């Protein structure tokens, strides 16, 4: 704009917020909620789209939302607290260390892990998750454990499975973009899924890229399951989901149910409603299941109408 | 116990780390200083189970969590953030407070320029306490520590456009075209004399209150330090005086030659103070964290921000 640019600029003039360093103690969280601000894009910048995401503390974000009354100028600097808050300087590994890394530790005690990015198109999700990917760094860290002389008992066969769910119509990105079937006995279990066993972290990357190559990408979720198996017996399964754009009517009720199913994980779940909640129902039960949410946003003023909902979604997932 | 709000404030502050202001911090030196100071919840305030409602996550940042209601009557919070040069809380002494607001200014008056400090806010916030020992006295010895010149002391109150000097027992004065004659300026040789001037002035039996430090060499003014304790921002003629202040201060970041007066008695006598290539000012907006005095608290802040202007 102009005006709303100086009120902000004036605000960030006395700001002394501190930046979260890698050294910062990794916390161990049962249900972690973080927010990732995305750096400003040269196109968003070229139009002089104004930076409006103040992240003064490792544990804190701000939004100087622009509204007006006489039309005499004001700014409503709104605060939202979180477990973590990433800025435009936070690298991928930086976001990894505090979301998915501790969760790798959880699958090696048969525990269930599930980790989401949840934001609009052009917020960071499907980037910020997947060599760049939280996917990729998950494996790299996973293989390292298998090597360690501490888990080498339980002679495990690393596997892989990348599928995509679109309007109840799921699809396995492991075949010629084939479709699948889902049922549950009088528990949940898929049908046709082809567990791809990998034994190199490089394997996973060239295994993922299929779904990458296959798959607007924004009307569907991408769900990636890491499963540990010892002797064909299932250990623990890790689900990494690049959710469908949070901004077509079934989608909102897929997130109605998801949000509802992260609520009862804290209270120790209305799964039967949506297809996303059905496949990952396991990771929402017992004292062995940890989840991590990455509600990612956009730094621009135009987004503020819609990135204040993503922030409102997230604030209702910590209770 | 309204209870539900105090629940929502604590599930906020739980996830929140804070890096306060410490003595390790540098002493900043600006044109116009806008600070804020939250007082602690007193007993009588605690005994009613009043939720603290204001946080200070850092030296400058200030967060207020205000209780809002839907048409549902769904209890809500709206977390408003504010920035200032130095925001400080309960833990902050006056020694902390003087060092970051008035302390840089003592050096200013010995230069040849002229400095003024206001504590502004709601009744029972912490204005009188902040300035009244208080900032008046704290400047004094540090004013007196800096060493041929003599020092003079003024103390007076402004009500209903009238002007009293407390130094003489209720001694009414007049203001004219700027010069207030009957200006009681007692000469002091050290904090000893000055300390006696404050409490005597304060002892007198909804009002502005001004204390002045003055310097003369040939018998000619050198530096003027004016420390004002304003009235409560909540007969309603007080609303105007404080409103003028904002305009008076604002013309000091525009390095402006012209300022407005007349419509404010307070200003008139403090009026040399808002001009020159060497006039600095600090503003202390003190607030009451008692949740059921939040509207007054917000009003106390929306006045003070962007008056960095």
């Amino acid at each position: 704009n102009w005006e709303f640019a100086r009120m902000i600029k004036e605000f960030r003039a006395t700001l002394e917020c501190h930046p979260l360093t890698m050294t910062d103690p990794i916390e161990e969280h049962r249900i972690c909620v973080c927010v990732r601000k995305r750096p400003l894009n040269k196109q968003e910048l070229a139009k002089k789209e104004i930076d409006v995401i103040s992240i003064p503390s490792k544990c804190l974000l701000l939004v100087h939302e622009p509204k007006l009354k006489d039309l005499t100028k004001y700014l409503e600097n709104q605060a939202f607290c979180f477990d973590f808050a990433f800025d435009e300087t936070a690298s991928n590994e930086v976001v990894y260390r505090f979301t998915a890394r501790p969760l790798v530790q959880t699958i090696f005690e048969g525990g269930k892990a599930t980790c989401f990015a949840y934001g609009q198109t052009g917020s960071g999700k499907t980037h910020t998750m997947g060599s760049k990917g939280i996917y990729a760094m998950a494996s790299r860290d996973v293989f390292l454990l298998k090597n360690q002389p501490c888990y080498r008992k339980l002679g495990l066969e690393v596997y892989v499975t990348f599928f995509e769910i679109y309007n109840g119509k799921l699809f396995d990105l492991l075949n010629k973009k084939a479709k699948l079937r889902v049922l549950e006995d009088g528990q949940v279990q898929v049908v046709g899924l082809q567990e791809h066993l990998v034994n190199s972290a490089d394997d996973v990357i060239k295994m993922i890229d299929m779904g990458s190559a296959c798959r607007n990408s924004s009307r569907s979720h991408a769900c990636f399951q890491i499963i540990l198996r010892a002797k064909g017996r299932m250990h623990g399964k890790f689900s990494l989901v690049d959710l469908a754009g949070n901004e077509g009517a079934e989608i909102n009720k897929s997130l109605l149910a998801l949000k509802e199913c992260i609520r009862a994980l804290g209270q120790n779940t209305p799964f039967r409603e949506s297809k996303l909640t059905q496949v990952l129902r396991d990771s929402f039960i017992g004292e062995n299941s940890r989840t991590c949410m990455i509600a990612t946003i956009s730094p621009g003023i135009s987004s503020c109408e819609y990135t204040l909902n993503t922030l409102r979604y997230a604030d209702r997932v910590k209770e | 116990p309204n209870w539900e709000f105090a629940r929502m404030i604590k599930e906020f502050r739980a996830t929140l780390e804070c890096h306060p202001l410490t003595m390790t911090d540098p002493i900043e030196e600006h044109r116009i200083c806008v600070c804020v100071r939250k007082r602690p919840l007193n007993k009588q305030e605690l005994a009613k189970k009043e939720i603290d409602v204001i946080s200070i996550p850092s030296k400058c940042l200030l967060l207020v969590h205000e209780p809002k209601l839907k048409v549902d009557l769904t209890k809500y919070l709206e977390n408003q953030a504010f920035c200032f040069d130095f925001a400080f809380d309960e833990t902050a002494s006056n020694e902390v407070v003087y060092r970051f607001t008035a302390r840089p200014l003592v050096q200013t008056i010995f230069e040849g320029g002229k400095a003024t400090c206001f504590a502004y806010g709601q009744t029972g916030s912490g204005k009188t306490h902040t300035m009244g020992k208080g900032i008046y006295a704290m400047a004094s010895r540090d004013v007196f520590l800096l060493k041929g010149l003599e020092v003079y002391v003024t103390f007076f109150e402004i009500y209903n456009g009238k002007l009293f000097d407390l130094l003489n027992k209720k001694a009414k004065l007049r203001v004219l075209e700027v010069q207030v004659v009957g200006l009681q300026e007692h000469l002091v040789n050290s904090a000893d004399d000055v300390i006696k001037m404050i409490d005597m002035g304060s002892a007198c039996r909804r009002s502005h209150a001004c204390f002045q430090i003055i310097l003369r060499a040939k018998g000619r003014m050198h530096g003027k330090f004016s420390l004002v304790d304003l009235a409560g921002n909540e007969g309603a003629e007080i609303n105007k005086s404080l409103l003028a202040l904002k305009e008076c201060i604002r013309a000091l970041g525009q390095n402006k030659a012209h300022t407005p007066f007349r419509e404010s008695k307070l200003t008139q006598v403090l009026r040399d103070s808002f001009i020159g290539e060497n006039s600095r000012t600090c503003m202390i907006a003190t607030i009451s964290p008692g949740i059921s005095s939040c509207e007054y608290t917000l009003n106390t802040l929306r006045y003070a921000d962007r008056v960095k202007e």
Binding site: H18, C59 | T15, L16, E17, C18, H19, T22
Partner: peptide, 7 residues
């Protein structure tokens, strides 16, 4: 743990 007022 969390979280602590310090710096």
């Amino acid at each position: 743990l969390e979280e602590q007022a310090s710096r």
